[PDB]
Write an enzyme that holds these catalytic residues in place. Sequence first.
Site, mmCIF file in Angstrom:
data_model
loop_
_atom_site.group_PDB
_atom_site.id
_atom_site.type_symbol
_atom_site.label_atom_id
_atom_site.label_comp_id
_atom_site.label_asym_id
_atom_site.label_seq_id
_atom_site.Cartn_x
_atom_site.Cartn_y
_atom_site.Cartn_z
ATOM 1 N N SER A 213 0.783 -1.243 0.000
ATOM 2 C CA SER A 213 0.000 0.000 0.000
ATOM 3 C C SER A 213 0.817 1.298 0.000
ATOM 4 O O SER A 213 0.260 2.356 -0.340
ATOM 5 C CB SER A 213 -1.005 0.020 1.144
ATOM 6 O OG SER A 213 -1.814 -1.147 1.122
HETATM 7 C C1 3LC Z 1 -1.501 -2.203 1.798
HETATM 8 O O1 3LC Z 1 -0.435 -2.349 2.363
HETATM 9 C C2 3LC Z 1 -2.529 -3.286 1.845
HETATM 10 N N1 3LC Z 1 -1.867 -4.583 1.939
HETATM 11 C C3 3LC Z 1 -2.269 -5.650 1.248
HETATM 12 O O2 3LC Z 1 -3.236 -5.644 0.495
HETATM 13 C C4 3LC Z 1 -1.477 -6.895 1.507
HETATM 14 N N2 3LC Z 1 -1.867 -7.687 2.436
HETATM 15 O O3 3LC Z 1 -3.018 -7.205 3.135
HETATM 16 C C5 3LC Z 1 -3.221 -7.989 4.382
HETATM 17 C C6 3LC Z 1 -4.554 -7.468 4.886
HETATM 18 C C7 3LC Z 1 -2.101 -7.678 5.362
HETATM 19 C C8 3LC Z 1 -3.380 -9.516 4.161
HETATM 20 O O4 3LC Z 1 -3.647 -9.926 3.016
HETATM 21 O O5 3LC Z 1 -3.257 -10.224 5.179
HETATM 22 C C9 3LC Z 1 -0.289 -7.096 0.656
HETATM 23 C C10 3LC Z 1 0.195 -6.200 -0.238
HETATM 24 S S1 3LC Z 1 1.687 -6.756 -0.902
HETATM 25 C C11 3LC Z 1 1.501 -8.237 0.006
HETATM 26 N N3 3LC Z 1 2.404 -9.224 -0.101
HETATM 27 N N4 3LC Z 1 0.432 -8.285 0.766
HETATM 28 C C12 3LC Z 1 -3.430 -3.119 3.094
HETATM 29 C C13 3LC Z 1 -4.856 -3.605 2.878
HETATM 30 C C14 3LC Z 1 -5.641 -2.776 1.901
HETATM 31 N N5 3LC Z 1 -3.357 -1.764 3.623
HETATM 32 C C15 3LC Z 1 -2.753 -1.475 4.784
HETATM 33 O O6 3LC Z 1 -2.246 -2.311 5.531
HETATM 34 N N6 3LC Z 1 -2.697 -0.131 5.065
HETATM 35 S S2 3LC Z 1 -2.237 0.474 6.486
HETATM 36 O O7 3LC Z 1 -1.009 -0.111 6.924
HETATM 37 O O8 3LC Z 1 -2.324 1.892 6.350
HETATM 38 N N7 3LC Z 1 -3.423 0.051 7.691
HETATM 39 N N8 3LC Z 1 -4.700 -0.426 7.306
HETATM 40 C C16 3LC Z 1 -5.323 -0.627 8.510
HETATM 41 C C17 3LC Z 1 -6.650 -1.133 8.851
HETATM 42 N N9 3LC Z 1 -7.736 -0.381 8.431
HETATM 43 C C18 3LC Z 1 -9.023 -0.750 8.691
HETATM 44 C C19 3LC Z 1 -9.308 -1.868 9.373
HETATM 45 O O9 3LC Z 1 -10.575 -2.246 9.637
HETATM 46 C C20 3LC Z 1 -8.197 -2.741 9.868
HETATM 47 O O10 3LC Z 1 -8.458 -3.787 10.505
HETATM 48 C C21 3LC Z 1 -6.853 -2.292 9.556
HETATM 49 N N10 3LC Z 1 -4.511 -0.261 9.568
HETATM 50 C C22 3LC Z 1 -4.795 -0.333 11.016
HETATM 51 C C23 3LC Z 1 -4.601 0.988 11.755
HETATM 52 C C24 3LC Z 1 -5.486 2.079 11.194
HETATM 53 S S3 3LC Z 1 -5.493 3.584 12.143
HETATM 54 C C25 3LC Z 1 -6.861 4.483 11.518
HETATM 55 O O11 3LC Z 1 -5.748 3.250 13.521
HETATM 56 O O12 3LC Z 1 -4.285 4.309 11.850
HETATM 57 C C26 3LC Z 1 -3.306 0.158 9.054
HETATM 58 O O13 3LC Z 1 -2.369 0.536 9.704
#
Ligand code: 3LC
Length: 500
Positions: free
Chosen positions: A244
């Site tokens: 991401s």
């Molecule tokens: C981007 O990194 C994207 N990753 C993927 O699509 C990949 N795997 O996704 C996961 C879910 C880990 C999996 O398949 O198990 C991927 C890409 S390349 C590869 N080999 N695998 C994801 C999913 C769209 N995006 C993020 O991880 N972005 S983030 O780090 O900014 N982030 N997203 C969330 C959550 N948002 C909403 C929810 O309901 C959750 O459960 C998680 N979070 C949590 C904290 C959010 S906050 C508002 O408190 O800051 C992140 O940190």
Amino acid sequence: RSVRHIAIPAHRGLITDRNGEPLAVSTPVTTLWANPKELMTAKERWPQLAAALGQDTKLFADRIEQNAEREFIYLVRGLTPEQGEGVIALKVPGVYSIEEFRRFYPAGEVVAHAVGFTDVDDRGREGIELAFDEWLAGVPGKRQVLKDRRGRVIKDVQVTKNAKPGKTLALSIDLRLQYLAHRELRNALLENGAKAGSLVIMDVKTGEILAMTNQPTYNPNNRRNLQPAAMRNRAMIDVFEPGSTVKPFSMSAALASGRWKPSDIVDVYPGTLQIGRYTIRDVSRNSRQLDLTGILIKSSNVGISKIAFDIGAESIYSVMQQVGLGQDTGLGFPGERVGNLPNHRKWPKAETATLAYGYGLSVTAIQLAHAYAALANDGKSVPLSMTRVDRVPDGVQVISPEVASTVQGMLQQVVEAQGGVFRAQVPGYHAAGKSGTARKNAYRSLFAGFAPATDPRIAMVVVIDEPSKAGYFGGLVSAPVFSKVMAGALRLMNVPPDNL
Ligand SMILES: *C(=O)[C@@H](NC(=O)/C(=N\OC(C)(C)C(=O)O)c1csc(N)n1)[C@H](C=C)NC(=O)NS(=O)(=O)n1nc(C2=NC=C(O)C(=O)C2)n(CCCS(C)(=O)=O)c1=O
């Protein structure tokens, strides 16, 4: 009797940080050596010599007999003059003391991966020590001597060629930022029970690598056992899927296409999208209409995929290639990886989507930081440097300044907006960035960003490999590390606070 020419070793140049702080210093060490041919005439002295060297009498005597055809053997290396003088006070024929130059690394483990080290012969073996070995080594001199039948130097006739000392090298590293980054990365590995990590800090205006740290690390002053995993400069030699964190580059292509504006909407319901046998999946799946900023805030894979189908993967691949993802940095660090940005003649739908959200591409932490630096520097990429930059080389405009400025604003919203990555907020400043989480069961947690958002100065990438606690998302794991290290780096660099 024989007239011979022998080498004069050269003094290896000093490595400093950007402000002159010593990182690798050639220090005098007392070496004791012996001529076995001369030793044969003084056997009665051998046991006392063995005792002084802390060697068993018989093993020592056997050692002299096994090397009887040699004119040189090392007895002990790295003593103090006082220690050497004690062995010399025995006055054993064929025993000599010498002051030799040997590297000492004053910051030890803190800059081990960047600096690297020299071998026992004082030659660059790893890191900068290897990469800049010609610059640092200098040129040995030549001495003319008269040697007896045993090879003992009878007279020093003349110097035929004086030695030329190696040259000083000032790195781009700011040791103050390096210590800060090292400490916070270490702390985050403990908090998350993680296996490894990397943290890179870059000056967006000069292309300088201000800090480059990894965990695990090692003490280059005491390399006795000697772990391969600990010696890896992961920021440069390890590749990973950025996931991401590449969505701002897909967004840059979207805005440059003429077909998208930040307030345009994409319907991401029901949080999944089937493309034949492949399913694109979002983490939170309670959205329908999201604007382009929302797609980044919510990190919607479905949203970025639909934008990618509209603009085509070629436009996205081109932005990623221009910002240097999966491309040669030109740095030439030993073992540095290029990574891989996949390409196709005709991009299929599944590959268009995965490219857009950073799946199936591999980059290094240095590449990812350099790409964010270009975005932060109003789309202009300044060439990378591991050395202090006095005259800044011309940059290349890789994203148009208006598009880069719009994407910068979107990334500030990712950090500051309601529902955003609040843990990346930097006290006193406006910051911008994007987190990522890559499934490698096992995860890699990422954060990439820059600050101050109103006039960017520093780009930073935090990579935490295999966090083992319940928390694994990049926004939870890596974003707070970015906050602490960015706040510290901005304060050390006297960057005026912009969140007034
Ligand atoms: C981007 O990194 C994207 N990753 C993927 O699509 C990949 N795997 O996704 C996961 C879910 C880990 C999996 O398949 O198990 C991927 C890409 S390349 C590869 N080999 N695998 C994801 C999913 C769209 N995006 C993020 O991880 N972005 S983030 O780090 O900014 N982030 N997203 C969330 C959550 N948002 C909403 C929810 O309901 C959750 O459960 C998680 N979070 C949590 C904290 C959010 S906050 C508002 O408190 O800051 C992140 O940190």
